[PDB]
Symmetry: D2
């Protein structure tokens, strides 16, 4: 409930469906440890990645597999994937939404943090 991911398609004007998303947490030795993953729904959303109990302060990476998404549509893309890296802080609001708007040679990403 603390972390949700939403992906939109700027070519078709639609949610980006069945996009793979991987989340990692930074470990003591500076490597990225798998944390959570899933595929976006028909609404372009990925819910249920983690819980309040598990989502402690730390540095997290969200990797969105944009290349496979475009290839499935028959479109040649530029990026291998989209990556969003951020620090989770207990000071700020409690719910994080990471959103990405996708085009073949561009993407935009923003965070909405509420509560």
């Amino acid at each position: 409930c603390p972390l949700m991911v939403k992906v939109l398609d700027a070519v078709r004007g639609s949610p980006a469906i069945n996009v793979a998303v991987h989340v990692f947490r930074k470990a003591a030795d500076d490597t990225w440890e798998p944390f959570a993953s899933g595929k976006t729904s028909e609404s372009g959303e990925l819910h249920g990645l983690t819980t309040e109990e598990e989502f402690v302060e730390g540095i997290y990476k969200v990797e969105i597999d944009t290349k496979s998404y475009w290839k499935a549509l028959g479109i040649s893309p530029f990026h291998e994937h989209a990556e969003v890296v951020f620090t989770a802080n207990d000071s700020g609001p409690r719910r994080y939404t990471i959103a990405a708007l996708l085009s073949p040679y561009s993407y935009s990403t923003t965070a909405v943090v509420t509560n």
Copy 2:
């Protein structure tokens, strides 16, 4: 239900609340006639602008009063407002979401059309 507007703030990482939004429809004589309006909610959303019965094919303009939003926050903005102009077509999906992501000197806008 056919038309919803969502506004986000890229400086604060939050919904853009209490932003004025005006919708117009293009008339026969080429002028813009008021159609619907409102202010975004605490979630940054504006629901209930129109009905399926009233939202006929035509050219529509959505004007978002970004200047007043930034001025209320004490921030000097570039744009007078953000404007989104589009044709509604019965061919395509039935529900239109117009989203805008706001910064003082930039904005991005996208449309999600579903069903």
Copy 3:
């Protein structure tokens, strides 16, 4: 020049070439008066729209004709055009770059404003 427009294509990863651009200025009577127009070059840039002398204080609208652009590529896009409306030169002369990044159902626009 004091006003330049740059347009990029996010589907192709290229400048958006031959895009029509019309500029208007709000008149004393509150109507939009034609001010300048042109088309983007092979670099996606449009220079020479105006001069420091002619580009006085006022509210300006830069209308970028994205629909025509996309239709010629075989795409039926969402927007009729992209419109950028701003006050210019109200604290003295500035140089303005208006940039737009285009996709079929989305666009992003930003401005870079410098002082000579």
Copy 4:
């Protein structure tokens, strides 16, 4: 040059100056090897990172140090950095411009790819 990076500030309406940028290339062993680095100029541009000879086929990562940028302006931003990962030169040499538009809680990036 075959690889240029441009960075803009959406809060100020200006080039983003003195932004650190690090480039890496994926090694045969699947690790990220340092490839080039630099900082943006007063124009927000970073030129001279590499040459056509050195910029061979491979997977590259361009890491833009946005957090440090924002903190010096008194803003605590959301992202640690902005990272752009792409395959380059796999159909022969190309010229790449990587552009990034920055806000405290958002960034947009695009690429323009041309053939000389």
